[PDB]
Amino acid sequence: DSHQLAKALAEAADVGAQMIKLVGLRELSEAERQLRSLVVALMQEVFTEFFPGCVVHPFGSSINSFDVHGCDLDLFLDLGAAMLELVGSILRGCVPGVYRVQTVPSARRPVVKFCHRPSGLHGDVSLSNRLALHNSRFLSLCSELDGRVRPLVYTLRCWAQGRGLSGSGPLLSNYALTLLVIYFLQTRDPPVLPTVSQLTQKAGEGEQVEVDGWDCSFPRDASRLEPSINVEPLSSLLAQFFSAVSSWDLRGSLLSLREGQALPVAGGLPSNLWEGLRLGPLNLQDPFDLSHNVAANVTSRVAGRLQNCCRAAANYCRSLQYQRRSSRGRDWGLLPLLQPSSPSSLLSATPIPLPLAPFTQLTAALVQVFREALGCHIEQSASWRCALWHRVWQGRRRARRRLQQQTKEGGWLATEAQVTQELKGLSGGEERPETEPLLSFVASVSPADRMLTVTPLQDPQGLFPDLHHFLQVFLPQAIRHLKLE
Known part of the structure; x- marks a missing residue:
């Protein structure tokens, strides 16, 4: 944990090399991907026996190329509570190796949590979530569009975990945080990532897909899209991130990844506030489902603490300790950001x-x-x-x-x-x-x-x-x- 991260990152070059090395350390190995693919094969085979012509789609942390060691294996089953119970009982009884099976219809996205014993894996089985597929593929696409995306996201994710700004509670989801990073990269004067509107309008032929009335269409390869004119290095983009999100107006702005722009909640919100869009302390619009605020679960405390920790982090990024390396100093560069927050602070x-x-x-x-x-x-x-x-x-x-x-x-x-x-x-x-x-x-x-x-x-x-x-x-x-x- 702190030993590996400190001793490995302290020895490498500058901040950028730290971020990239962090990505290299936390990303899934080949064996882990093999295990996951094999289990997915098991699931797919059994569910094919019971539901002919059905497809098991790995989504979430697995395919968005933000995957980390011991991450959840999220599965969308392409074929309401009763059907969920059916799938759960099929898991429990048929596919070998799964033991803990718990149905959770209560969530906004009802899911069957399962745990596979021989691989030691665990995850969710969703009967209907098709948006997760396309926006996860969108995330991986973003990682294909520019090479700074993955280091930025890994770093900021581990940082938010350290600060307790991310979680399954009122805290920001990893998807929400990732969307925040991407949106930040879209708003740079030399834009790092193109807006989702640009990807949809560019796209390509045969790539049309509509899910739940929302257009999920984006190019499937980064080759057809021109690179970024942004020459900024990783460290600069990190500091700029902290500063940006700290200086933004969260309550009065709905951040649109589709338009790559901050739209005022003050009646600068066209189409009469697309029905089903919750507004609050933090407003972050899903790139595809516009009636969905991915940050809608974020309370005022969490948003305020976000801006505060980002302000403090931005202040740290202007310090000399961050910029210049250290020889035998254990804490330089990325490491104090990656250092977890005090348990007292975390509990307060x-x-x-x-x-x-x-x-x-x-x-x-x-x-x-x-x-x-x-x-x-x-x-x-x-x-x-x-x-x-x-x-x-x-x-x-x-x-x-x-x-x-x-x-x-x-x-x-x-x-x-x-x-x-x-x-x-x-x-x-x-x-x-x-x-x-x-x-x-x-x-x-x-x-x-x-x-x-x-x-x-x-x-x-x-x-x-x-x-x-x-x-x-x-x-x-x-x-x-x-x-x-």
Whole structure:
């Protein structure tokens, strides 16, 4: 992980060589591709026995040439929930080697997750997703159009993973991030990649394909398209990326890869906002399905954190450490970007889900949960500054056991408070004047969605993550039990 990446990238030339070497290291080997193709052959053969004339299409991370080690194997089955169950049972029962089979109809794109034992692979089986095929082939096409695309995407992907800006949650999907990189490359003054409109209008004869009413047509080879007039190197394009996405207006702009342009949400959105297009903190238009915002799942927190981390990364890219190499210095160039973010930062990033309740009642409830039941000293969306001189998050089992033992030999809130107090007195201390808290933090609740965002202030012993997990479990319990009274 950090050993391989650091020792391999620190020894190579400049930033560009680092990016390319990173691509070389993280891309799938020949054996891995062989394994994948063989399993796909298994799937295809069995499904051909049961569904004559059906085609299993590998898509996603496999064919977009952004593939990484241990990536998912995504399969589109070309032949509603009941049919999904049928496919799942066929997987489970027939094709050899698959064991974990779990149906997920609930997603926007219903899929059957499966796990193949002998190859140790895993993936999704989608009954209908045809857009994934064509836009993945579009991605691979982009990687064919210019050679800087793949290094940029690999680097920025690993970076976003490190920063916790990408994920299966409210975070940006890898597809969304890739589309962001491509869009960035389309908007350069010497454009790196042609717009999707240009690819469709150029295209070629016999390449017409329409999926769900959207035109998926693009050239199948990069040879017929003229190269880029952009002479910019990798490092410059990286810094320019960070700067660009940090300086952009995300809420007021729908980024179109089709048009290669930022269209204002302010009523600069033609065709009456193509029906089914969700607007929000980040608006990124799919190059093919225009009614689909690939970033529609991205919340305000994630977008803001994106722009912040991109601003900090852009500031780093202007530094000397990034530009010039280092001899035996382990951290130079690409490496600090690829270095993962602090677990404290990562946890302050992820919010804490709270039960349904009126905002006012919920906030009052929370400050009650911090005031008593926890040793917190609190003071004034809603936000509170809390301080702790004791470890509240640990030892509560022994404490409540002790109290119940004193109950043996001799509703909510205050009882837990007793626990906290008896954690405090026997024995964390008597506290003290002059204070200087053990752990101090900030609790914030937004009106919608209602989620607690806990960020650390003073954490000398670095025990904040313990507190964060503790709160993750405890605060919903607190609110729930307070509701039960």
